[PDB]
Amino acid sequence: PRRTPQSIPYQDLPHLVNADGQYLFCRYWAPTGTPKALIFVSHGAGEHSGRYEELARMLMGLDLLVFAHDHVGHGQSEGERMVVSDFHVFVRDVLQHVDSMQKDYPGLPVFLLGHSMGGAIAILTAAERPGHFAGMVLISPLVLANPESATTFKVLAAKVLNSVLPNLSSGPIDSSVLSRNKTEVDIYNSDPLICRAGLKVCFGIQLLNAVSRVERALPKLTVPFLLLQGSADRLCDSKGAYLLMELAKSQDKTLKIYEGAYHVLHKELPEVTNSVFHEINMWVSQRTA
Numbered sequence: 263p264r265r266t267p268q269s270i271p272y273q274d275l276p277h278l279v280n281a282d283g284q285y286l287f288c289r290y291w292a293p294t295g296t297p298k299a300l301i302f303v304s305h306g307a308g309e310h311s312g313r314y315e316e317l318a319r320m321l322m323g324l325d326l327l328v329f330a331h332d333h334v335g336h337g338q339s340e341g342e343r344m345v346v347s348d349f350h351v352f353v354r355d356v357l358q359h360v361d362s363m364q365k366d367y368p369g370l371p372v373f374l375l376g377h378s379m380g381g382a383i384a385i386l387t388a389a390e391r392p393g394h395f396a397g398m399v400l401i402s403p404l405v406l407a408n409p410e411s412a413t414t415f416k417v418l419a420a421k422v423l424n425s426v427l428p429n430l431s432s433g434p435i436d437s438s439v440l441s442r443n444k445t446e447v448d449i450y451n452s453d454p455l456i457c458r459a460g461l462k463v464c465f466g467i468q469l470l471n472a473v474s475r476v477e478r479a480l481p482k483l484t485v486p487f488l489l490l491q492g493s494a495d496r497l498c499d500s501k502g503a504y505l506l507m508e509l510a511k512s513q514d515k516t517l518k519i520y521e522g523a524y525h526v527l528h529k530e531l532p533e534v535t536n537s538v539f540h541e542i543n544m545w546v547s548q549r550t551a
């Protein structure tokens with residue numbers, strides 16, 4: 263039997279098989295009552311859907327049916343770690359899962375929530391289906407990379423794009439520069455499902471493709487969205503959040519800036535994280551009433 267990269271049979275776990283024949287590990291949090299709407303949670307690079315437990319339980323408490331999967335190459339899903347043939351695979355697979363859930367639970371509005379790379383995935387997913395999603399919640403979405411990191415990486419990208427160098431990698435990200443909450447940093451560094459090795463250059467190239475596709479997608483994006491962004495984000499430059507507010511055509515767009523906060527806003531200092539949860543609660547509540 264087919265097993266996760268951690269050797270657990272998929273027959274023992276919630277799962278979906280994608281269009282490439284790869285098993286994706288899935289998670290669901292459903293309310294006891296009749297659901298008001300569906301919401302897919304889209305995680306970021308190197309992490310996995312289990313990192314969203316608290317946010318998902320909050321959303322389920324609003325009577326939404328929350329669902330997620332680990333993207334290919336991540337967590338408990340199949341695929342070479344941190345490899346993707348093309349960035350659109352992630353979007354395709356979100357749409358498969360959304361479509362499957364809307365068959366099982368028809369008539370319900372569907373929301374997206376995405377953080378970091380998962381926010382770029384959410385933007386591209388909404389852009390592919392104009393008018394179909396009720397709303398999107400974006401926590402520090404990948405819109406523009408940190409300009410310094412992007413320039414340095416595009417050097418390594420020059421090597422890989424012009425030569426055959428399948429194993430070249432960037433240096434690892436310093437997990438401390440992504441949340442001021444030292445306890446959350448230590449938890450991140452302790453999670454065996456997180457890939458904290460340096461990014462394979464081929465994967466960073468797909469992240470560059472994500473940035474390029476997001477830019478082209480903005481002037482067509484019409485979905486309602488809430489955008490939460492820290493002013494001291496060393497990974498997803500806050501300039502991208504301002505560009506998203508400016509260039510999206512959405513009639514319902516809201517930006518909240520967290521002054522001095524780092525990248526992982528839902529795992530930041532307690533004052534920030536409590537506000538993040540409250541603001542998402544209010545925003546989704548107002549749009550599922």
Ligand SMILES: O=C(c1ccc2nc(-c3cnccc3C3CCCC3)oc2c1)N1CCN(c2nc3nc(Cl)ccc3o2)CC1
Nearest residue numbers: 306307378379407412415432440446447450461466469526
């Ligand atoms: O989605 C992402 C993400 C988004 C954009 C990225 N860009 C690169 C990158 C890396 N090396 C060279 C070049 C590049 C770019 C390639 C194009 C130009 C630059 O890596 C990225 C990862 N992330 C961040 C790490 N995560 C995380 N969660 C966490 N939680 C806690 Cl508590 C503490 C720390 C945490 O770190 C999960 C969510």
